[PDB]
Design an enzyme around this catalytic site. Structure first.
Site, PDB file in Angstrom:
ATOM      1  CB  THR A 268     -22.311  -1.916 -10.078  1.00 45.92           C
ATOM      2  OG1 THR A 268     -20.291  -1.677 -10.040  1.00 45.92           O
ATOM      3  CG2 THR A 268     -22.322  -0.307  -8.765  1.00 45.92           C
ATOM      4  CG  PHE A 393     -23.354   0.309 -17.994  1.00 42.28           C
ATOM      5  CD1 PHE A 393     -23.124   0.078 -16.526  1.00 42.28           C
ATOM      6  CD2 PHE A 393     -24.011  -0.048 -18.581  1.00 42.28           C
ATOM      7  CE1 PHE A 393     -22.878  -0.815 -16.961  1.00 42.28           C
ATOM      8  CE2 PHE A 393     -25.058  -1.565 -18.799  1.00 42.28           C
ATOM      9  CZ  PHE A 393     -23.453  -2.269 -17.519  1.00 42.28           C
ATOM     10  CB  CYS A 400     -20.624   3.428 -16.283  1.00 40.92           C
ATOM     11  SG  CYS A 400     -19.370   2.407 -15.457  1.00 40.92           S
TER      12      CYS A 400
HETATM   13  C1  HEM Z   1     -22.866  -3.827 -13.362  1.00 42.22           C
HETATM   14  C2  HEM Z   1     -22.064  -2.689 -13.098  1.00 42.22           C
HETATM   15  C3  HEM Z   1     -21.745  -1.028 -13.214  1.00 42.22           C
HETATM   16  C4  HEM Z   1     -22.814  -0.566 -13.283  1.00 42.22           C
HETATM   17  C5  HEM Z   1     -24.084  -0.237 -13.578  1.00 42.22           C
HETATM   18  C6  HEM Z   1     -22.912   1.231 -13.295  1.00 42.22           C
HETATM   19  C7  HEM Z   1     -23.299   2.180 -12.673  1.00 42.22           C
HETATM   20  C8  HEM Z   1     -22.734   3.414 -13.176  1.00 42.22           C
HETATM   21  C9  HEM Z   1     -23.767   4.281 -13.092  1.00 42.22           C
HETATM   22  C10 HEM Z   1     -25.129   4.414 -13.328  1.00 42.22           C
HETATM   23  C11 HEM Z   1     -22.829   5.659 -13.191  1.00 42.22           C
HETATM   24  C12 HEM Z   1     -22.929   7.177 -13.715  1.00 42.22           C
HETATM   25  C13 HEM Z   1     -23.322   7.629 -11.878  1.00 42.22           C
HETATM   26  C14 HEM Z   1     -23.303   9.379 -12.068  1.00 42.22           C
HETATM   27  O1  HEM Z   1     -24.238   9.977 -12.804  1.00 42.22           O
HETATM   28  O2  HEM Z   1     -23.724   9.974 -11.376  1.00 42.22           O
HETATM   29  C15 HEM Z   1     -21.647   4.722 -13.272  1.00 42.22           C
HETATM   30  C16 HEM Z   1     -20.202   5.612 -12.933  1.00 42.22           C
HETATM   31  C17 HEM Z   1     -19.045   5.028 -13.089  1.00 42.22           C
HETATM   32  N1  HEM Z   1     -18.522   3.466 -12.881  1.00 42.22           N
HETATM   33 FE1  HEM Z   1     -19.758   1.688 -13.189  1.00 42.22          FE
HETATM   34  N2  HEM Z   1     -21.119   0.600 -13.020  1.00 42.22           N
HETATM   35  C18 HEM Z   1     -20.619  -0.512 -13.158  1.00 42.22           C
HETATM   36  C19 HEM Z   1     -19.318  -1.207 -12.855  1.00 42.22           C
HETATM   37  C20 HEM Z   1     -18.262  -0.091 -12.636  1.00 42.22           C
HETATM   38  C21 HEM Z   1     -17.160  -1.057 -12.708  1.00 42.22           C
HETATM   39  C22 HEM Z   1     -16.497  -2.409 -12.546  1.00 42.22           C
HETATM   40  C23 HEM Z   1     -15.787   0.197 -12.535  1.00 42.22           C
HETATM   41  C24 HEM Z   1     -14.442  -0.501 -12.843  1.00 42.22           C
HETATM   42  C25 HEM Z   1     -14.059  -0.821 -12.620  1.00 42.22           C
HETATM   43  C26 HEM Z   1     -16.659   1.317 -12.748  1.00 42.22           C
HETATM   44  C27 HEM Z   1     -16.347   2.132 -12.593  1.00 42.22           C
HETATM   45  C28 HEM Z   1     -16.798   3.488 -12.550  1.00 42.22           C
HETATM   46  C29 HEM Z   1     -16.857   4.914 -12.823  1.00 42.22           C
HETATM   47  C30 HEM Z   1     -14.797   5.194 -12.175  1.00 42.22           C
HETATM   48  C31 HEM Z   1     -17.558   5.865 -13.435  1.00 42.22           C
HETATM   49  C32 HEM Z   1     -17.303   7.892 -13.279  1.00 42.22           C
HETATM   50  C33 HEM Z   1     -17.350   7.538 -14.438  1.00 42.22           C
HETATM   51  C34 HEM Z   1     -17.002   9.186 -14.910  1.00 42.22           C
HETATM   52  O3  HEM Z   1     -17.701   9.765 -14.256  1.00 42.22           O
HETATM   53  O4  HEM Z   1     -16.036   9.347 -15.591  1.00 42.22           O
HETATM   54  N3  HEM Z   1     -18.154   1.245 -12.736  1.00 42.22           N
HETATM   55  N4  HEM Z   1     -21.078   3.344 -13.297  1.00 42.22           N
HETATM   56  C1  LIG Z   2     -18.361   5.901  -6.264  1.00 46.27           C
HETATM   57  C2  LIG Z   2     -19.708   4.416  -6.289  1.00 46.27           C
HETATM   58  C3  LIG Z   2     -20.471   4.415  -7.189  1.00 46.27           C
HETATM   59  C4  LIG Z   2     -21.215   3.260  -7.196  1.00 46.27           C
HETATM   60  C5  LIG Z   2     -22.586   3.121  -8.033  1.00 46.27           C
HETATM   61  C6  LIG Z   2     -22.465   4.051  -9.174  1.00 46.27           C
HETATM   62  C7  LIG Z   2     -21.100   4.906  -9.620  1.00 46.27           C
HETATM   63  C8  LIG Z   2     -20.319   5.468  -8.404  1.00 46.27           C
END
Ligand code: HEM
Ligand SMILES: C=Cc1ccccc1
Length: 455
Positions: A268, A393, A400
């Site tokens: 991502t 996000f 996120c």
């Molecule tokens: C530009 C970069 C990123 C994008 C566009 C992004 C996007 C997303 C999205 C769309 C979700 C929701 C997924 C869903 O609903 O199924 C998510 C969840 C999550 N992401 Fe990111 N992400 C990025 C970077 C990161 C980074 C750098 C980390 C960790 C250092 C991270 C950790 C997580 C975690 C742990 C979740 C689950 C949160 C929860 O449900 O409690 N992500 N992300």
């Molecule tokens: C665990 C993989 C993942 C990848 C993109 C958004 C959130 C979670």
């Protein structure tokens, strides 16, 4: 009264399933949404979902009293190695809310101040790599961005150096994590998964799960043994207690969080930096305005946290890249109870929705007619953007947790890149977006001519 939902072409008893049997399924679903509009039904043997594209309907899908996160089939496959880490947990599992409450302070904008120095350590290693290229060598952009983001998560998170800038072949852990993600995604288009053709895949997947578990379990055990006091993500999970239940995470769930940070954040974030640089070289006037801000603000040899917060136009570049090509392009929801969507679409408890983020981000009723233009200035007055129009996000409590980490990293790195180098699209590169769990401009390459500014 009730409206009937359009549906793309069908394949007899396979219904719509063969439409996703393609190399670029998100891009295929965007073309369907252009043809059918804000909502369409998608059926497969034994399942149905409804794909949403408009801000009007996605504002309602984002109501947490009516819809909660669903695990897509991709996340259910990733769960075989990411366990009950935050991304692959249901909101109703005990370890979701416990890990969310323990981790949230470690991911705040304020927490970025303590991760900054180690983000600069890896960012300086990328700049030095580029400064040390010979004349007319070139850069492989997604590959170098991914070396950067993996090493930054590993260092800032758990004080581990993958040393990706010292290698052609990645650290064994990375090779195993990348081959496990790749198998999990390949299982989505596998007609006969118990065919002997997949025996070796099975064996290799179990081997890579053991490589990941073994490394991460040892790092956790080494840290607990040494008693080394730190403030990193691992420190906070070893030390932290959920204020609700009063319990800490157990060592097995800590391992799943560490694996999760690596897989959720690596591609991502490296895709965002790759798409941002792609759009800058294709829009030289926007590149020039972002380079002028980087030169005006980044006045010292090492950027500070306060300087990175003043790279306002760089921040708008990054938001405009996430508008056009959000690198985690879809998320799934289920109805918590019977309800009616948008005054005309009745839903039954359990019914699934999919949010098609790139299509949401092209809704002309929000953004106007120039939705395909790369224009960062569209983010100058962000209080004017209606609710739930911009969702790279995700949504609500299940949004996120790494958003602040990803944007601080990407603003710092893109600012240093623009301060230090002029860029050439020497191949007149043709955008080709490869899809896995995430989006990448495959094969994007540039030349970087140093401005000869010391570090
Ligand atoms: C530009 C970069 C990123 C994008 C566009 C992004 C996007 C997303 C999205 C769309 C979700 C929701 C997924 C869903 O609903 O199924 C998510 C969840 C999550 N992401 Fe990111 N992400 C990025 C970077 C990161 C980074 C750098 C980390 C960790 C250092 C991270 C950790 C997580 C975690 C742990 C979740 C689950 C949160 C929860 O449900 O409690 N992500 N992300
Ligand atoms: C665990 C993989 C993942 C990848 C993109 C958004 C959130 C979670």
């Amino acid at each position: 009264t009730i409206k009937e939902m359009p549906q793309p072409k069908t394949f007899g008893e396979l219904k719509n399933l063969p439409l996703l049997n393609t190399d670029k399924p998100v891009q295929a679903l965007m073309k369907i949404a252009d043809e059918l509009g804000e909502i369409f039904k998608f059926e497969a043997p034994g399942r149905v979902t409804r794909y949403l594209s408009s801000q009007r309907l996605i504002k309602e899908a984002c109501d947490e009293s009516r819809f909660d996160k669903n695990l897509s089939q991709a996340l259910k496959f990733v769960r075989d190695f990411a366990g009950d880490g935050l991304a692959t947990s249901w909101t109703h599992e005990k370890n979701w809310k416990k890990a969310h409450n323990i981790l949230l302070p470690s991911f705040s904008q304020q927490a970025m101040k303590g991760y900054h120095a180690m983000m600069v350590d890896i960012a300086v290693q990328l700049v030095q790599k580029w400064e040390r290229l010979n004349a007319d060598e070139h850069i492989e952009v997604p590959e170098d961005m991914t070396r950067l983001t993996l090493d930054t998560i590993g260092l800032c998170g758990f004080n581990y150096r993958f040393n990706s800038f010292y290698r052609d072949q990645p650290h064994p852990f990375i090779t195993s994590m990348v081959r496990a993600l790749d198998e999990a995604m390949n299982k989505l288009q596998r007609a006969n998964p118990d065919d002997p053709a997949y025996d070796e895949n099975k064996r290799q997947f179990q081997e890579d799960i053991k490589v990941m578990n073994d490394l991460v379990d040892k790092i956790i055990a080494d840290r607990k043994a040494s008693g080394e006091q730190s403030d990193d993500l691992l420190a906070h999970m070893l030390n932290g207690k959920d204020p609700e239940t009063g319990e800490p995470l157990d060592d097995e769930n800590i391992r799943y969080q560490i694996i999760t940070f690596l897989i959720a954040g690596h591609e991502t974030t490296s895709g965002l930096l790759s798409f941002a640089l792609y759009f800058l070289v294709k829009n030289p006037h926007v590149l020039q305005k972002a380079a002028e801000e980087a030169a005006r603000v980044l006045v010292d040899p090492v950027p500070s946290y306060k300087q990175v917060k003043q790279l306002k136009y760089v921040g708008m570049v990054l938001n405009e890249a996430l508008r056009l090509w959000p690198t985690a392009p879809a998320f799934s929801l289920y109805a918590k109870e019977d309800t009616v969507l948008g005054g005309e679409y009745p839903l039954e408890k359990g019914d699934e929705l999919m949010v098609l983020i790139p299509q949401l981000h092209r809704d002309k009723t929000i953004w106007g007619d120039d939705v395909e233009e790369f224009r960062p200035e569209r983010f100058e007055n962000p209080s004017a953007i209606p609710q739930h129009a911009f969702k790279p996000f995700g949504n609500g409590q299940r949004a996120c947790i790494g958003q602040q980490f990803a944007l601080h990293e990407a603003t710092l790195v893109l600012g240093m890149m623009l301060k230090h180098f002029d860029f050439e699209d020497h191949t007149n590169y043709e955008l080709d977006i490869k899809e896995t769990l995430t989006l990448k401009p495959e094969g994007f390459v540039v030349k970087a001519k140093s401005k000869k500014i010391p570090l």
